[PDB]
């Protein structure tokens, strides 16, 4: 228990690994099969220090046959996810949607520096978790160089 | 079971409008699951997506005839029709009106589920000819010549359709003269040649035409 020290609240870091790391399919239409819209879920969201470089990512625009986005609205601190390899430009339809998009595995929606638990509309994501670690002022020196 | 079938005019003139209705009878047009389209097929050319509706009224055309396409639904009536304004003689087509099944959790995956019969629609300022049914006297071979008839298409059946096997009904061709000329023959035992009775059912949906020509021999 006594293993480990922290000495300051910055050494605490949350880093987020994109699925595509456990070797998940990237394809966006398997990727698509991963999400679904529900109606009564708040959406919550947590925000993280570091992540992973995404080897795809997704910019989605779910629309009503009539042309209304179903997707939620981003708040201002919802941002692109800094570093991709890949960016698949997707428009869908769904008539019968209602609610808001959420991930059926449990992953989050990885944004810069934020975890959703909603997709945002307009906004580039990759699926991922997060971890939280302590990593010191002098290790985390080294990583990045 | 779903079943589509079209109805439209089969010719219009140029720099007119073209109208086609699309009735679809088994199901309600009124689903949830479904979005209605269009798609025609050039001579000779592959499948053209002209747009699709969905039965509350969302419509979704393709970017080159968006600026003249209009397709409306009627769930009173259980059809959705299509409008192809300033027609021109690149819009000679068979059109094909479709169903398009779509299922998804976060959106919808499409595969176009039921299809329609097709109505060959000629763009042209000519006016409308009905057909002249002549016979092809005669194994022995013997048939129908469904001369100068415009615009297409023509469909000759054989013994009200009992008679299938055999049957060669052979493309139409265009004559100097503008119009259309068809031949279908059928190839049948000499021995049934006094017995068994031979008539073919010409028919010209464009106008309205339906002989029953009787083939004999001599
Ligand atoms: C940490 O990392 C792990 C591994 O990377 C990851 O595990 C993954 O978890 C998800 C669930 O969260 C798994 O997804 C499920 O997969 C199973 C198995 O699919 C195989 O088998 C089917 C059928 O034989 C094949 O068709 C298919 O091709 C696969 O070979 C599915 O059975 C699951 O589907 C059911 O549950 C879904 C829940 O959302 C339903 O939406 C779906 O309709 C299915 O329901 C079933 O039962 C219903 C009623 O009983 C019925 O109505 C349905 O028709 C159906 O019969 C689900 O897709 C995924 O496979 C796991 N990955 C691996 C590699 O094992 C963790 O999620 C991850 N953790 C976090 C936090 O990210
Ligand atoms: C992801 O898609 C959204 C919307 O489809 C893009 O946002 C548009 O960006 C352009 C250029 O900045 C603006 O002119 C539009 O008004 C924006 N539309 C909306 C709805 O916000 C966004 O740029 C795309 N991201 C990437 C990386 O391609
Ligand atoms: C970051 O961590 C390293 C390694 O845990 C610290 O270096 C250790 O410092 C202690 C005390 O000076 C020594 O007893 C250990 O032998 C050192 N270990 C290694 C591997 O060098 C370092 O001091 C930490 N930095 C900060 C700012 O706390």
């Known amino acids: 228990v006594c293993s480990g020290t922290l000495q300051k609240t910055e050494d605490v870091h949350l880093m987020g690994f994109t699925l595509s790391g456990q070797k998940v399919a990237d394809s966006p239409l398997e990727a698509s099969k991963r999400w679904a819209f529900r109606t009564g879920v708040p959406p919550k969201n947590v925000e993280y220090t570091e992540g992973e470089e995404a080897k795809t990512c997704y910019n989605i625009s779910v629309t009503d046959p009539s042309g209304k986005s179903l997707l939620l609205d981003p708040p201002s601190n919802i941002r692109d996810y800094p570093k991709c390899k890949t960016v698949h430009h997707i428009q869908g339809q769904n008539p019968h949607a209602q609610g808001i998009a959420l991930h059926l595995w449990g992953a989050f929606f990885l944004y810069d520096r934020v975890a959703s638990t909603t997709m945002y509309r307009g906004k580039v994501f990759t699926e991922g978790n997060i971890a939280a670690m302590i990593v010191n002022k002098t290790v985390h020196r080294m990583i990045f160089s | 079971q779903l079943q589509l079938q079209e109805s439209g005019p089969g010719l219009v003139k140029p720099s007119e409008t073209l109208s086609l209705t699309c009735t679809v009878s088994?199901?309600?047009?009124?689903?949830?699951?479904?979005?209605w389209g269009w798609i025609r097929q050039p001579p000779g050319k592959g499948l053209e997506w002209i747009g699709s509706?969905?039965?509350?009224?969302?419509?979704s055309y393709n970017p080159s005839l968006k600026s003249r396409a209009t397709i409306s639904v009627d769930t009173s009536k259980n059809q959705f029709s299509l409008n192809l304004d300033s027609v021109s003689a690149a819009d000679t087509a068979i059109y094909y009106c479709?169903?398009?099944?779509?299922?998804?959790?976060?959106?919808?995956?499409?595969?176009?589920?039921?299809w329609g019969k097709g109505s060959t629609v000629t763009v042209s300022s000519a006016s409308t000819k009905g057909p002249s049914v002549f016979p092809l006297a005669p194994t022995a071979a013997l048939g129908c010549l469904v001369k100068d008839y415009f615009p297409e298409p023509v469909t000759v059946s054989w013994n009200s359709g009992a008679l299938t096997s055999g049957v060669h009904t052979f493309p139409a061709v265009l004559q100097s003269s503008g119009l259309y000329s068809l031949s279908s023959v059928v190839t049948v035992p000499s021995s049934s040649l006094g017995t068994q009775t031979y008539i073919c059912n010409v028919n010209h949906k464009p106008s309205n035409t339906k002989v029953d020509k009787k083939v004999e021999p001599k």
């Open positions: 088994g199901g309600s047009i009124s689903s949830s699951s479904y979005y």
């Open positions: 509706v969905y039965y509350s009224g969302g419509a």
């Open positions: 479709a169903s398009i099944y779509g299922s998804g959790t976060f959106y919808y995956y499409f595969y176009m589920d039921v």
